[PDB]
Design a protein around this motif. Structure first.
Motif, PDB file in Angstrom:
ATOM      1  N   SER A 106       0.841  -1.188   0.000  1.00 21.85           N
ATOM      2  CA  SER A 106       0.000   0.000   0.000  1.00 21.85           C
ATOM      3  C   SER A 106       0.880   1.243   0.000  1.00 21.85           C
ATOM      4  CB  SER A 106      -0.932  -0.020   1.220  1.00 21.85           C
ATOM      5  OG  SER A 106      -1.794   1.101   1.258  1.00 21.85           O
ATOM      6  N   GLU A 107       0.673   2.121  -0.973  1.00 27.13           N
ATOM      7  CA  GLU A 107       1.524   3.289  -1.094  1.00 27.13           C
ATOM      8  C   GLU A 107       1.330   4.258   0.070  1.00 27.13           C
ATOM      9  OE1 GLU A 107       0.892   5.833  -4.531  1.00 27.13           O
ATOM     10  OE2 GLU A 107       2.963   6.515  -4.398  1.00 27.13           O
ATOM     11  N   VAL A 108       2.424   4.893   0.474  1.00 29.53           N
ATOM     12  CA  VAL A 108       2.437   5.924   1.510  1.00 29.53           C
ATOM     13  C   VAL A 108       2.861   7.214   0.837  1.00 29.53           C
ATOM     14  CG1 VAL A 108       3.593   6.768   3.606  1.00 29.53           C
ATOM     15  CG2 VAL A 108       2.918   4.364   3.405  1.00 29.53           C
ATOM     16  N   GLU A 109       2.093   8.285   1.049  1.00 29.79           N
ATOM     17  CA  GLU A 109       2.473   9.583   0.498  1.00 29.79           C
ATOM     18  C   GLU A 109       3.711  10.106   1.216  1.00 29.79           C
ATOM     19  OE1 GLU A 109      -0.093  13.054   1.155  1.00 29.79           O
ATOM     20  OE2 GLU A 109       0.229  13.628  -0.936  1.00 29.79           O
ATOM     21  N   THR A 110       4.758  10.409   0.456  1.00 25.87           N
ATOM     22  CA  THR A 110       5.977  10.918   1.053  1.00 25.87           C
ATOM     23  C   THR A 110       5.753  12.330   1.587  1.00 25.87           C
ATOM     24  OG1 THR A 110       6.879  11.942  -0.952  1.00 25.87           O
ATOM     25  CG2 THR A 110       7.256   9.569  -0.639  1.00 25.87           C
ATOM     26  N   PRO A 111       6.577  12.760   2.547  1.00 27.32           N
ATOM     27  CA  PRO A 111       6.493  14.159   3.011  1.00 27.32           C
ATOM     28  C   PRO A 111       6.619  15.153   1.870  1.00 27.32           C
ATOM     29  CG  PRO A 111       7.855  12.845   4.486  1.00 27.32           C
ATOM     30  CD  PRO A 111       7.582  11.981   3.290  1.00 27.32           C
ATOM     31  N   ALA A 112       7.579  14.935   0.969  1.00 24.93           N
ATOM     32  CA  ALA A 112       7.739  15.845  -0.161  1.00 24.93           C
ATOM     33  C   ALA A 112       6.534  15.793  -1.093  1.00 24.93           C
ATOM     34  CB  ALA A 112       9.023  15.520  -0.921  1.00 24.93           C
ATOM     35  N   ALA A 113       5.964  14.602  -1.307  1.00 30.26           N
ATOM     36  CA  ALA A 113       4.797  14.514  -2.179  1.00 30.26           C
ATOM     37  C   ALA A 113       3.604  15.232  -1.559  1.00 30.26           C
ATOM     38  CB  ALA A 113       4.456  13.057  -2.486  1.00 30.26           C
ATOM     39  N   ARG A 114       3.456  15.150  -0.233  1.00 31.86           N
ATOM     40  CA  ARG A 114       2.363  15.864   0.417  1.00 31.86           C
ATOM     41  C   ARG A 114       2.518  17.372   0.247  1.00 31.86           C
ATOM     42  NH1 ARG A 114      -1.631  15.310   4.326  1.00 31.86           N
ATOM     43  NH2 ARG A 114      -1.980  17.217   5.555  1.00 31.86           N
TER      44      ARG A 114
END
Ligand code: UBG
Length: 358
Positions: free
Chosen positions: A137-145
């Motif tokens: 399950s993908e986790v949104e990275t801090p940079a992507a957020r």
């Protein structure tokens, strides 16, 4: 313990990839409610062959007829898990098939496939083993957020235009006519559920499908599905070359996995009109870069993805739905692993775990 990603490590022969079979489907309605049927599937309905060329205004309706789904609502695998839970005793493949499978979203597999060529955007995948099955399950990275929250108006509108293109190209009923006069509501989605296998790794994954083509000679899904895309109009050979090298890689990866055989592209001008349409058969996309020194190689994509699945399977020894092995990757480095329990990374919900355990 880490996994390298450079293309040169993965340029051997194309690996085994099983012809995908559709196990089922599900739909999400305008209120984002799940339905285990195809009510959200629409039907390819392109401009009539004798009439004028397309001139689709992809900005029409933005933003007053735009109902975007709430991107802060976290869904992870939940809709797919509901399908699995409701079909777990009806699954093909024989006793123990699910226990040896890897379960994920098609889009997660796409990001694996494109990793050896990706220069800009990293990813994180949470992995949990539960009753033998490996869940990704993908986790949104801090940079992507941060990038999401700071999304420029132009890209917000571009995302709308992608959804709007489907409204010009698709009808609610086979042989019907598109009706672009309504709302673009991105809660609505139609998902195909597929079985494949990469190397020695059985796969169960779902993917959003844009439409079914009633004019297609083969009516059996996924052979009858068409993926819709837009892209900037191109004028020079250099622009086409950059498109083949960078955009087609992601289009190929996305439709190759579920066995969707055609991508139809609307080319939009700077004013936001689609004035050209082109069909890209998935199995012919690689032809545009096969003898290209700067091209991509489907074998590299699939061999890396197989290596990642072997790496994840060997890394996640513990069967425990509350445990997460987080696989992290950034351009220029290997995939690295960190281990976490419970919130926030744990993603298998009690309603799934409790039903499956009983
Ligand atoms: C913070 C966050 C917000 C998300 N919001 C959405 C959402 O609002 N709607 C949605 O369908 N999925 C969203 N996703 C992704 C879902 O979690 C899930 O991965 C995906 O929906 C599973 O369906 P697949 O068919 O496997 O996704 P993909 O093969 O990756 O893409 C299929 C279609 O999903 C849409 N989509 C995919 N990813 C996103 C995204 N990050 N943001 C907006 N649209 C996206 C878009 O229409 C795309 O078509 P196109 O490729 O032409 O751009 C979000 C993910 C994160 C981390």
């Amino acid at each position: 313990p880490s996994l390298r990603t450079q293309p040169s490590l993965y340029s051997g022969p194309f690996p085994f990839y099983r012809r995908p079979s559709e196990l089922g489907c599900f739909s999400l309605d305008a209120q984002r409610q799940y339905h285990g049927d195809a009510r959200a599937l629409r039907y390819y309905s392109p401009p009539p062959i004798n009439g004028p060329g397309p001139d689709f205004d992809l900005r029409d309706g933005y933003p007053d007829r735009y109902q975007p789904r709430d991107e802060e609502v976290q869904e992870r695998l939940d809709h797919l898990l509901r399908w699995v839970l409701e079909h777990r005793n009806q699954l093909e493949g024989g006793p123990g098939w699910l226990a040896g499978a890897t379960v994920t979203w098609r889009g997660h597999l796409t990001k694996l496939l494109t990793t050896p060529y990706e220069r800009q955007e990293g990813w994180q995948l949470a992995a949990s083993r539960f009753q033998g099955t490996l869940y990704l399950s993908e986790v949104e990275t801090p940079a992507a957020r941060a990038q999401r929250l700071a999304r420029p108006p132009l890209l917000r509108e571009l995302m709308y235009m992608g959804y709007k293109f489907s409204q010009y190209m698709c009808a609610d009923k086979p042989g019907g006519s598109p009706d672009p006069s309504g709302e673009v509501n991105t809660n609505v989605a139609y998902c195909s559920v597929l079985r494949s296998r990469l190397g020695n790794h059985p796969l169960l994954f779902s993917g959003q499908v844009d439409c079914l083509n009633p004019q297609a000679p083969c009516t059996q899904p996924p052979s009858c599905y068409v993926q819709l895309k837009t892209s900037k109009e191109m004028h020079s050979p250099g622009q086409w070359r950059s498109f083949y090298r960078h955009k087609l890689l992601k289009w190929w990866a996305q439709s190759f996995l579920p066995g969707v055989p055609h991508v139809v592209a609307g080319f939009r001008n700077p004013e936001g009109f689609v004035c050209s349409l082109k069909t890209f058969p998935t199995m012919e996309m690689f032809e545009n870069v096969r003898n290209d020194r700067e091209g991509w190689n489907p074998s590299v994509c699939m061999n890396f993805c197989a290596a990642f699945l072997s790496f994840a399977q060997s890394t996640v020894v513990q069967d425990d739905p509350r445990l997460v092995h987080l696989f992290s990757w950034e351009p220029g480095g290997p995939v690295t692993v960190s281990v976490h329990r419970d919130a926030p990374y744990a993603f298998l919900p009690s309603w799934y775990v409790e039903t499956m355990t009983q």
